[PDB]
Design a protein around this ligand. Sequence first.
Ligand SMILES: [Zn+2]
Lengths: 30, 65, 38
Amino acid sequence: DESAPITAEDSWAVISAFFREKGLVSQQLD
Amino acid sequence: MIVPVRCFSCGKVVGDKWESYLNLLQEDELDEGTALSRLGLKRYCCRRMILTHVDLIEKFLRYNP
Amino acid sequence: KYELGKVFIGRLPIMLRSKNCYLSEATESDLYKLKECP
Ligand SMILES: [Zn+2]
């Protein structure tokens, strides 16, 4: 079932990854 | 930073209860609400003291001098 | 037309945490020794 649709709580797992990588000032550094 | 001695609202000593609370969580796996209550922290004024504490001192200690 | 090195030009301020900054490849414990806040 690894191809099951995503829930609403799962969007936070993506947001976690966005910030784990980019941080809060990616614009300034990049 | 560093556990408040005495709850602001009623002044029940809360200074002793810190390590004991942190222990009832790691060692006893217990949920926050039971640990607080175990420690006799019944009034929410007292509960908020421990439950919402941020022991910044521990980061502060990480610097050498 | 017949034919008959590396020079310093200036000091450029670095933005902290950038590639050129020391703190970029810095671990948590590293920053603390450097008296910086992680
Ligand atoms: Zn109280």
